[PDB]
Design a protein around this ligand. Sequence first.
Ligand SMILES: [Cl-]
Ligand SMILES: [Cl-]
Ligand SMILES: [Cl-]
Ligand SMILES: [Cl-]
Ligand SMILES: [Cl-]
Ligand SMILES: [Cl-]
Lengths: 180, 176, 176, 179, 177, 180
Amino acid sequence: GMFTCKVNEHITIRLLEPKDAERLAELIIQNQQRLGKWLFFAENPSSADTYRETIIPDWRRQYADLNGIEAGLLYDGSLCGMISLHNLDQVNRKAEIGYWIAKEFEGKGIITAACRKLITYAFEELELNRVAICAAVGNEKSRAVPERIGFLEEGKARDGLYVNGMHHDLVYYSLLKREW
Amino acid sequence: GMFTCKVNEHITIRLLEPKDAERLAELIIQNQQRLGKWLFFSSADTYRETIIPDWRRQYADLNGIEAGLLYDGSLCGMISLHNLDQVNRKAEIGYWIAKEFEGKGIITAACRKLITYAFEELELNRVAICAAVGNEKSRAVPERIGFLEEGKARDGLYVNGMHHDLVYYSLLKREW
Amino acid sequence: GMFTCKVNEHITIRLLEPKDAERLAELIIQNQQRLGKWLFFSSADTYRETIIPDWRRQYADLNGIEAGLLYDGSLCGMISLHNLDQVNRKAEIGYWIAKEFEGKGIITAACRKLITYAFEELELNRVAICAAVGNEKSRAVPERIGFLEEGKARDGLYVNGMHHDLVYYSLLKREW
Amino acid sequence: GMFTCKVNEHITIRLLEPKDAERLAELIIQNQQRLGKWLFFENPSSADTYRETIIPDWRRQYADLNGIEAGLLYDGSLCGMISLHNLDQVNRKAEIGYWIAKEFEGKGIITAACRKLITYAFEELELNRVAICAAVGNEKSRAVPERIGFLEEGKARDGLYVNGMHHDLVYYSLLKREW
Amino acid sequence: GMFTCKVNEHITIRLLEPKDAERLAELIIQNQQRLGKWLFFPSSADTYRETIIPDWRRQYADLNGIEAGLLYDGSLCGMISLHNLDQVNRKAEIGYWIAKEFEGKGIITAACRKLITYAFEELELNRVAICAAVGNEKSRAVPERIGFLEEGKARDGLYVNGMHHDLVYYSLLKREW
Amino acid sequence: GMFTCKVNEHITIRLLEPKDAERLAELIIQNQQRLGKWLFFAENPSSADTYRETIIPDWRRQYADLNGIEAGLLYDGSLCGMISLHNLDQVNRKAEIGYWIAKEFEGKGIITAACRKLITYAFEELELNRVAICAAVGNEKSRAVPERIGFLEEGKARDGLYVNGMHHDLVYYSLLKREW
Ligand SMILES: [Cl-]
Ligand SMILES: [Cl-]
Ligand SMILES: [Cl-]
Ligand SMILES: [Cl-]
Ligand SMILES: [Cl-]
Ligand SMILES: [Cl-]
């Protein structure tokens, strides 16, 4: 990585590249039954070849054009999962954050730390005013993230998700620049 | 229009076209300092050359409809289905109408047709409407129709300099 | 469809959609023959991802309309306004329909609507219909509507290894 | 011009470049309307728009292989355009059009350039049919197809809008088994 | 072809066309790699007809470079290109290769010369450069016959089947004309 | 910037963004009657709109597409120049480096320091074999950069540069990944 984001001496964020195709792909299979509650939706497989030629390239192109960041999470130099800034709406000065992490790395404080830099990035660099995270109401290591950083529940989206044939509610949390 | 959507008499819905440009801009200037609370917000050339055509390509590519409203054959506003998300089987609906035509019950009837389309044609499960918190006129729409208030986005809107909260309403395909 | 053209209680003309891909291909195969005599060109895939997407985009950009014909609700064929030439204020109209439905006077009634569009909305001065010099059922159409024969295109067609001539018919605004 | 079409010691045909802009805008205005009849079209556009849009678009079209929009060069310089359009591959046919300045009339330029274009059409493209149409009252173009061996096919009623009005178009086709 | 560059009575240069795709693929397969040294180093008719040839054409339409075929007695014996065009710096490079079957007939030299006049007279560049693997006699000789001067070496400029070789560079200045 | 390259405590490298256009354009008008010896010619120089709408966006896509870097040099926070890796030839495993700096920032070793990070990346990530740098023959300050890091002079380009009306020679320099 020429351009990189050091979160701490253990956590690193960087934009994927095509050569990241294999690990991501494999890294999404090793956890292929679960990873849908964390608003992504890999109930039906990654491909590696698809990631190499289309998804990652599209992701970079998007970073190039400035609508968001689809990035990889790194712990001791290995892809553990991904973090993301999306639904960027400059006029309204806001974006949302998503993320997910391989089970093995659950519990080391990765996502929470990665979100913090990403939050700092969002408020100081993009001069955004609001950042939101959402998570399936249902159970959450994921809701736990906005709650240690200090977001506020603001609402629910009834049937906001459609994972594995099932309808779930989505709960919204938001954090304002002045509160941060 | 070859292709059109009759809501009832007086009220027809249709994609815009380059030639709608001079009037769309006129209609937007006479209302400039309002559409924003209505979640929208101009050089009538830009619409002809860039914005109307983009809205059209976007409809051709199937993600959303940005359409014009017509009262008795004239453009009096817009209605719109955006944030289409086929994976979560949900979308959202926005709208705005020129003062001139307020109170004749257009938006409501227009949304009713749009929701129908969302629900039996795109087979969406969820439809939301979103309104700045202080604008009773828009909120009145989800409310007569039967949506349920779902939450707020703190600081959701940035209208001419200030912060305002947005409030969401939703309708499920089964409550319909 | 949000946006249709209702010809008349049986017949609606409407844009095609990717999801028409499966029926559209079943309907061309069961008619792989007969169809180049009505001057028309693969898989439910190529239609789903490439052909219809471009027709729609063409419509969004304003050159012509490649629409489906719908009898009592389902696709029975397609009607077309092509070679739009604005400067010269003219265009052509082609069309085809599945055998299943050849008796219902669909093509003619659709054509009649599209003609109205060409002259009243597109403000065109001229519309032409073209046909294989030997397709009596095609030739009938312009003729019944009142088009004049203008001439022939020598070898204008190449249908399966062989070539056949094309006959032109035209209709001027001040006649319709 | 690296790649070129030598009609004869006198006439050459070749793609235009952006640098040809100045002299195409200029050669056309020298002659405001004498053009919509010649089936171009008026309100003559500038050198910039020819240099940055029209000529590049013509070249890309040639690269993709549908049609030629080429400049006509009479002994060194730009005296007109000839072109191959409505190239219909499934029906194996195209249409040829052209125009030259009032200054180059008489020298058989169009006729000569057409021939090569046609020859290309029939054995390279392997097209079956080549057509030319022209305004009924525009003997100058008409003499061309009649000179080469095309047959009058029909007239399109009101097929042209030169300036303000409408005139009819007369058609001429030339099949392959036939030249 | 409508548009053609006539080098001489036996040699013509022209843009390739999709239909040229089967012949280029074969011409390359039966030569193969002894062309990696030329500066070419595979893929099919299919890839040539639907991607490589079109990009080539499109780049000719855009006025950046020429990728053309060499024709000996109406037939494709190889290619020549004007690449790395740099209009601001008034310079370009020229490359080529022909099939063995057609070696020794003076084709490459002949087309280079034509290509050169054009680089100098019509595009009005000041500089023209050519390069070649340090040990590719056949290729190095063209520039020297024409009167290009060796300008320098690019260390490890080539990569031919896992080995790296040096590139030697020759330039020719307009006034040296 | 989220993703950057910390060269050292004062010098950072980053992809430029549309909002850097005003500063880039001004820096370019400010110099420019050099900037030719430096091998970066606008010729018909900047225009803050053009860099914002076209030039900076394309550079960003190139970075996404993975074929080069057009980055900004920041001293203590702000643009003082650009570094660049271009002519990326993955097949021959080689590429070239360019860079320019504003006069007021001359002589602090920004370029050298930044080229080393760039090289590192070139040799240990794109895994290139060769890296070159070229410069105007009489551009002592530029020439100094390669020679200080230990490249070797490889040859000359006769009239390779064309500055303000006239021609000058380009001299080439190259570093082979096995000399590191
Ligand atoms: Cl965590
Ligand atoms: Cl209302
Ligand atoms: Cl019928
Ligand atoms: Cl003549
Ligand atoms: Cl030789
Ligand atoms: Cl330095």
